[PDB]
Amino acid sequence: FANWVNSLGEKASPILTAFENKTLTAEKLANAMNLDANLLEQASIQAQ
Amino acid sequence: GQPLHLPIYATPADPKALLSAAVATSQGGGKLPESFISLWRFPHMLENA
């Protein structure tokens, strides 16, 4: 988890406090990884 | 047995960019203690404080 936070780096405070609340979304999470959000959406759907 | 084709050349791996995260914390501020009255007038208590 610490290595994930260090992988995030600069945008860590808003995404960690969004994870601290129960309102964390895929779309804020994708922007911290420079990834397309639909990829995380489909990965969530495949896990579901 | 020397091959006529020349062997393909490998592409080196990409190095990782080590990144640090710097976050800050929020400690709650302290409130005031209770007002306790004294004997002294204003300037002596003012100079004392």
Considering only the beta carbons, identify the residue of B20, B22, B23 that sits closest to A16.
B23
CA distance B15 to chain A (A): 14
Report how this structure was experimentally obtained.
cryo-EM
- Cβ atoms within 10 Å, residue A41: 13
Resolution value (Å, 1 decimal): 4.0
**Which tokens hold the place of B30?**
């302290």
Inter-chain touch B19–A12, beta carbons under 8 Å: no
The DSSP call for residue B38 is -
The candidate with the shortest Cα–Cα distance to A30, out of A21, A42, A39, is A39
Contact between A44 and A27 (Cβ < 8 Å)? no
CA distance B48 to chain A (A): 45
